[PDB]
Amino acid sequence: QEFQISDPMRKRVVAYEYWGFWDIEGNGVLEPIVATWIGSTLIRLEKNPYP
Amino acid sequence: MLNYNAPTDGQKSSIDGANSDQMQTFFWLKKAIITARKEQYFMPLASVTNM
Amino acid sequence: FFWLKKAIITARKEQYFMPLASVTNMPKHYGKTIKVYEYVPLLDDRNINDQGIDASGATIVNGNLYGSSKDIGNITSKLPLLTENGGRVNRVGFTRIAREGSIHKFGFFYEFTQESIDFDSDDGLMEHLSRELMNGATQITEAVLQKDLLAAAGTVLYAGAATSDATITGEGSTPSVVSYKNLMRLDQILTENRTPTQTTIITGSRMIDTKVIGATRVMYVGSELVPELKAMKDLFGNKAFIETQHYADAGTIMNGEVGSIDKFRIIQVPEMLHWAGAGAQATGANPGYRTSMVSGQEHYDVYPMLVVGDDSFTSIGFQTDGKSLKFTVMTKMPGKETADRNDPYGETGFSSIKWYYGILVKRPERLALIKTVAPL
């Protein structure tokens, strides 16, 4: 519970990912996306990379 | 003249009759003001002993 | 004795007023109120403003040229005239009006026990209970809508010589029964208020004994008034009511239609609501009109007769998926889930239903109504 490594770069924090479909262009066609947020900050947002 | 007057502070616009007032009289940001968490100093100096 | 294993059930009651109502979408996170503007024309009397200058350059009380007045003298007096070296002479004003409506809540529920669930000889009881619950909910909602429409009418024409509900009586020199002239007057009023028509005239067919009918509006009556309408005679003393079989050819018969009189196509609604005891007191000289007992005195019964126009009203829809009304049903079967904290037996259960309903009346002049007594 209280574990913490000395170097700040090596601290572990919990994150979330969202694998799903969204209408990116609003014309009615669902396309895959991926999004990632930590706390209340959205860091990564792009299409599905895997073929 | 079709004056605007001031719908707030009790002075109806010229165009309005005796039943209706202005619908929108203020702009709302929709983003709130929030306060951050207070820091914790004595908590890191504690190692847990699971019971 | 041997149980038949089949039940006797009565179906729903068909609903007429609910299908008419149009639905206005209201998003949540706003409140319990909806509002619209209404821009009055230039020349109507409702255009009460303070921006008037007459042709002589002096200020005047009214800003609309001339009101809804057809008098030739008045029009000639208040015409806008301009001299050649004209400037700052005639001014006009404008006005808008707002209307609103609100949403109200409803609901009811019932309870049952687990021993009743199991030991009961009949199987499938809870299906029956669900069926009656849903039917009751639908019937109640339709009744509420009809009640609000009857209360919110804009054009009211009492029959006979009455003035208010207390005056509508069926005894004396002039009983308050619907007449041909009353229907003609109702048509005249609706035509003046610019209410759009609903149907179209029905020309003839080539088949023997087929009359020609030119009604153009739809009128809802109760079940009690149908004999009175059938007995009506027009101005020249002939029959007025024309039954449906005469003009079924070369036309389309609407649902629940009994006939056509003058310029209205009558429609019978089984669940039509009537006031009770609204009329004046009834003595022993009753010619045979329906009465009712209020506070020990027999009062006459005042009856509807309603002509809903187009775009008159809309039904606010709160999370109804673009429908007039949507229900929410919950059930908890007995067991550990219903094992009460003070009673872990868990022998009971329940089922509940609820909804949100509200109505916005955009234009109340189009709604029309006639109040009459109904023969026994």
UniProtKB/Swiss-Prot annotation, chain A:
It is found in: Virion. Forms the portal vertex of the capsid. This portal plays critical roles in head assembly, genome packaging, neck/tail attachment, and genome ejection. The portal protein multimerizes as a single ring-shaped homododecamer arranged around a central channel. Homododecamer. This is Probable portal protein. It comes from Enterobacteria phage N4 (Bacteriophage N4). The gene is 59.
Swiss-Prot record, chain C:
GO terms for cellular component: viral capsid. It is found in: Virion. Coiled coil: none annotated. It holds the Pfam family Phage_capsid_4. Keywords: Capsid protein, Virion. Assembles, to form an icosahedral capsid with a T=9 symmetry, about 60 nm in diameter, and consisting of 535 capsid proteins. This is Major capsid protein. It comes from Enterobacteria phage N4.
